Design a protein around this nucleic acid. Structure first.
Ligand SMILES: [Mg+2]
Ligand SMILES: [Mg+2]
Ligand SMILES: [Mg+2]
Ligand SMILES: [Mg+2]
Ligand SMILES: [Mg+2]
Ligand SMILES: [Mg+2]
Ligand SMILES: [Mg+2]
Ligand SMILES: [Mg+2]
Lengths: 214, 61, 149, 65, 100, 141, 135
RNA sequence: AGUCCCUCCCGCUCGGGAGGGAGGCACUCUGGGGGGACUGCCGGCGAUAAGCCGGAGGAAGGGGCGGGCGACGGUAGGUCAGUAUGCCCCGAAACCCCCGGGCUACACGCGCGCUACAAUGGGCGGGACAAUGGGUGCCGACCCCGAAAGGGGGAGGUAAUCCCCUAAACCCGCCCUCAGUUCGGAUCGCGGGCUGCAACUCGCCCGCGUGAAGCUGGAAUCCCUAGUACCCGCGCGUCAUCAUCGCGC
């Protein structure tokens, strides 16, 4: 199936997974600019040394952040698209090899379908899927109310990544589509502001609810 | 001896096997070859349930 | 070039293809009806699994000799699904391994060290190394970094 | 339609029902009222030097102790 | 023509004393002695439930016993062999001598 | 050539399935026994069932009649050491059902423990019955 | 005839590396490094060599013996040993400075180990506990 | 690991490997002793005190990380069915033995779990990498017989020496393609075995056959802050045989 040249691939430059360069990737949003790490790096696997320190996740390559985000089950204690998705034993939790392969194949599909650098498309997707205003809850007379507040950039990035991962997880659940194809489809849809993307619709709903309660 | 194996030369007799409190009669038939005696002398009485008592459900305690 | 210089599975495939020319290697008469261990569930699907197993055993003896039946039984075991009970590890059977070793000895590739097990003869070592060299010659045309080794 | 960037210059303190909200002072970087300093409520971790994207620049948070 | 000595004790200090005495005996004579080799320590660990009854939260005790070991090799010379044969070990130290 | 339905031993078989899996529609033939009979008959187990000819179907049915006489091991049949004749037999469809029914009836006639358990619809192989095996409706206090 | 030996440790995996003048051949337990699988493990070992440069890479031979741990633990210990051997063999501080910028752990190691388990569902972990019920 | 000798392989040997013997304590390891971190240094806040916040260097930074040790008392909390013990009872039975039963019953309510409801998979062939512990009433390599479970001999080991002991999740190739199915494996039939004085009530293992509910779960509610949680197997205790458990790795 897979050619031997791909099974035994030897890199010679410091670039993401030995296949893509992030030299020409630019971040349009001024707020997310210092929180999307794009430094040159070959292997995106830091062995979880960043979670100890405050704001430590800022200097972690974005591809590894995506890999960590999809390394989960997906629907444990809340419903996504109206269903619990409890993978359990068959879940991808604690298997970083499989998540790495899924991300690699998704990037290949994205590059084939659009002809652009996959990291650029990922950056566009997270830029379009990050909300700008949220709400917090108050209690009065046994009734719950909302009050509009602003979001810090790091939380924006976290929410965007989680929503992309959840949409990809929901698309491949008990259907004929595979995980890599679902991830590529979700990223491409989110990059074009298409309402069929789970993340973009979620962002629109969040901002609408926040606006209607100023 | 509830664990005695039925043998062909035992066919035609009647044996009283202890069941815990009494000896019950067993008439040995040819199709009983190879089985233990205790298989034909039940030790427990069949259950017929009555009305559930106090504490049988959460609301009845 | 030696056995250490090539991936294991490709070498096993090539050796299995080559072993069909040796008259002393023949599947036993009960081969088409058995599983390869109590932890499996269905019969082997390849019509020539015997040669694959024999080639694997030969390469195993090359690398870890001397070795006996029990340790090979450990090697070919695996995890078993037990219905409602949790999965567990189990060993494999003995007849397949013993017959394969006896046939290999009859072919002159292995010999018996008393009280220790079975080891690879010079003939078998040459037989394996020649195929390994051929495979490496084929392989380095597409991976230029292998020319150094 | 795209909001206005603002820069955080001071941290005041935590607030909210469960201590989830922080009150900060920000300076507008772009738009009609560029250069003005107003206080705002923010959800999520934040530090001096961050940049927020406000959707409107006329609402000011009530001062907390 | 060599003797092998095995020592074992639950008290480290007594073991050191006996080893030092043997080393000094070997030093006071012209005889080569392979140094005291420390072998792995034996740990005996036993875990037991605390309460006599079964009521209450379950808590456990972890009791441990440690046994230390040493190994010494020395060449059989009667002038030094008698000296080590007459040394008196404490009651909590076990000594065994064999000729190889 | 290709036929979308093939009938073997009174059972209609799918023609789009592999032969080894197509043969499992017969009650009394699992995946392993089907593979054994395919190998004995000298047929590729992975061939489509729709390419069979009449002679091959006849051969398969003949093998199914007396598998032991055609080289299948005696420990692979589903009724070895028959209670009446003492031979090793393989049964399918109705004959299998009536053989099982006859076994249970024989157990019931002699009033054996397993016979009573079969009559009352209770577990036979020594399971506990206080917690599980519940099939009914809740009774109120 | 220079020979240099270095050591690397990572969560019960121990690697010993020997470096000398050569042609660029690197072997892990006798296997060429270009055949290590899976890919994520192969790239872990190759990073110090790629950082050093091709001229240095083709001028030395390295042989590594590693034991203990798992397939991912063994790769990292080999990586540490190779990095230390490289910085010692060439003995230039520009390369040592470059390694610290890219990954500090290449030279200082990783001291993390497993935490011993405790009662109340001991087999699962030191902190995971049995589900609690009240009625 | 370097150095020497012998034997065997490959591209025929410039070069590259594997065993064995000499030889060595370099490296790993084992275990005795010692060093190392003290808010010690730098900048702020506080009072100039007690301290707090942030940096350098460092293997380690602010109880460095994980454990043991639980004050005066209370809870008429649990235990006289581990042992010790007052009073009251039985004292030819409520004491001491033997045989057979029961604690394993089954319209039903509840606690903690295991296996699943499939592709973030099922099957078949092939390829990789551990640690803690235990062994003479015992662990048993190695050879032979058997399809499997198992059977007949039997080296070494009172153990850093011999054995349990070549883990699984993971990777490569082929079949299946969203279906109550090549998902799930409850229930039942026939046959073969081991332990034991005894396997029916009431044990565990293997082969062929059969093929239940289940297609993600209402109101509610539990655990967890880093080598932690999730996922994956292994060791010991109990033990003649029997682990969906406890304690550990
Ligand atoms: Mg395997
Ligand atoms: Mg499973
Ligand atoms: Mg752990
Ligand atoms: Mg009381
Ligand atoms: Mg009970
Ligand atoms: Mg299945
Ligand atoms: Mg029984
Ligand atoms: Mg379904």
């Amino acid at each position: 199936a897979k050619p031997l040249s791909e099974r035994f691939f030897i890199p010679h430059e410091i670039k993401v997974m030995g296949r893509w360069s992030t030299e020409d990737v630019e971040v349009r949003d001024p707020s997310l600019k210092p929180y999307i790490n794009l430094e040159p790096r070959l292997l995106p696997h830091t062995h979880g040394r960043h979670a100890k320190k405050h704001f430590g996740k800022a200097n972690v390559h974005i591809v590894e952040r995506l890999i960590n985000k999809i390394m989960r089950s997906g629907g444990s204690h809340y419903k996504v698209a109206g269903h619990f998705m409890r993978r359990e034993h068959r879940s991808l939790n604690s298997k970083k090899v499989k998540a790495y392969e899924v991300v690699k194949e998704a990037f290949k599909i994205i590059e084939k379908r659009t002809g652009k650098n996959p990291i650029q498309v990922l950056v566009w997707a997270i830029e379009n899927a990050a909300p700008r205003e949220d709400t917090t809850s108050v209690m009065f007379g046994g009734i719950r109310y909302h009050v509009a507040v602003d979001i810090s950039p790091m939380r924006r990035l976290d929410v965007a990544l989680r929503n992309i991962a959840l949409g990809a997880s929901a698309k491949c659940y008990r259907t004929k589509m595979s995980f890599a194809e679902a991830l590529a489809e979700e990223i491409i849809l989110a990059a074009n502001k298409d309402p069929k993307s789970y993340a973009y619709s979620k962002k629109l709903e969040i901002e609408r609810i926040a606006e209607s309660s100023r | 001896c509830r664990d005695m194996i039925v043998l062909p030369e035992m066919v035609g007799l009647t044996i009283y096997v202890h069941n815990g409190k009494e000896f019950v009669p067993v008439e040995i038939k040819p199709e009983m070859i190879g089985h233990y005696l205790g298989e034909f002398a039940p030790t427990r009485k069949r259950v017929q349930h009555g009305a559930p008592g106090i504490g049988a459900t959460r609301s009845s305690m | 070039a030696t056995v250490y210089d090539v991936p294991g599975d490709l070498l096993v495939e090539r050796v299995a293809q080559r072993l069909k020319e040796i008259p002393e290697i023949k599947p036993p008469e009960w081969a088409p009806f058995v599983k390869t261990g109590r932890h499996k569930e269905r019969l082997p699907e390849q019509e020539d699994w015997w040669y694959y197993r024999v080639a694997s055993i030969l390469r195993r003896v090359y690398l870890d000799g001397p070795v006996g039946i029990e340790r090979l039984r450990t090697y070919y075991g695996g995890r078993k699904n037990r219905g409602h009970a949790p999965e567990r590890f189990y060993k494999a059977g003995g007849s397949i391994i013993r017959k394969a070793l006896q046939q290999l000895e009859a072919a002159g590739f292995v010999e018996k060290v008393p009280g220790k097990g079975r080891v690879i003869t010079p003939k078998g070592r040459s037989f394996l190394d020649k195929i390994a060299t051929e495979l490496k010659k084929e392989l380095e045309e597409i991976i230029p970094e292998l020319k150094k080794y | 339609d795209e909001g206005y960037p603002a820069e955080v210059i001071e941290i005041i303190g935590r607030t909210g029902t469960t201590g989830d909200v922080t009150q900060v002072k920000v300076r507008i970087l772009e738009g009609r009222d560029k250069g003005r300093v107003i206080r705002r409520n923010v959800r999520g971790p934040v530090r001096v030097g961050d940049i927020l994207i406000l959707r409107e620049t006329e609402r000011e948070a009530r001062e907390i102790k | 023509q060599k003797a092998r000595i095995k020592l074992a004790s639950t008290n480290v200090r007594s073991l050191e004393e006996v080893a030092n005495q043997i080393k000094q005996i070997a030093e006071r004579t012209g005889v080569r002695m392979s140094g005291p080799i420390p072998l792995p320590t034996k740990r005996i660990r036993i875990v037991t439930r605390k309460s006599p009854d079964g009521e209450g939260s379950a808590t456990f005790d972890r009791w441990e016993l440690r046994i230390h070991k040493r190994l010494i090799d020395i060449e059989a010379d009667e002038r030094a062999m008698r000296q080590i044969m007459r040394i008196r070990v404490p009651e909590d130290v076990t000594i065994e001598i064999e000729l190889i | 050539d290709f036929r979308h339905i093939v009938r073997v031993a009174g059972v209609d078989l799918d023609g789009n399935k592999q032969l080894r899996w197509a043969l499992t529609a017969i009650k009394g033939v699992g995946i392993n026994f089907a593979t054994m009979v395919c190998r004995v008959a000298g047929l590729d187990p992975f061939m489509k069932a729709g390419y069979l000819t009449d002679e091959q179907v006849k051969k398969i049915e003949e093998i199914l009649q007396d598998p032991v006489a055609h080289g299948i091991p005696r420990w692979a049949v589903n009724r070895p050491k028959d209670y009446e004749t003492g031979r090793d037999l393989h049964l399918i469809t109705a004959k299998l059902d009536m053989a099982i029914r006859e076994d249970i009836m024989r157990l019931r006639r002699i009033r054996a423990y397993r016979g009573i358990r079969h009559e009352l619809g209770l577990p036979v192989r020594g399971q506990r019955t206080r917690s599980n095996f519940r099939r009914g409706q809740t009774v109120g206090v | 005839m220079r020979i240099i030996q270095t050591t690397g440790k990572r969560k019960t995996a121990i690697a010993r590396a020997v470096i000398r003048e050569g042609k660029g051949r690197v072997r892990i337990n006798g296997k060429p490094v270009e055949l290590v699988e899976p890919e994520i493990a192969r790239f872990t070992i190759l990073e110090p060599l790629i950082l050093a440069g091709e001229e240095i890479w083709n001028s030395v031979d390295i042989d590594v013996k590693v034991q203990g741990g798992g397939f991912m633990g063994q790769a990292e210990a080999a990586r540490i040993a190779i990095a230390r051997a490289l910085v010692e063999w060439t003995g230039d501080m520009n390369l040592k400075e470059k390694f610290i910028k890219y990954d500090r752990t290449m030279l200082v190691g990783d001291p993390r180990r497993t935490e011993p388990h405790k009662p109340n569902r001991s087999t699962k972990g030191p902190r995971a506990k049995r589900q609690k019920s009240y009625r």
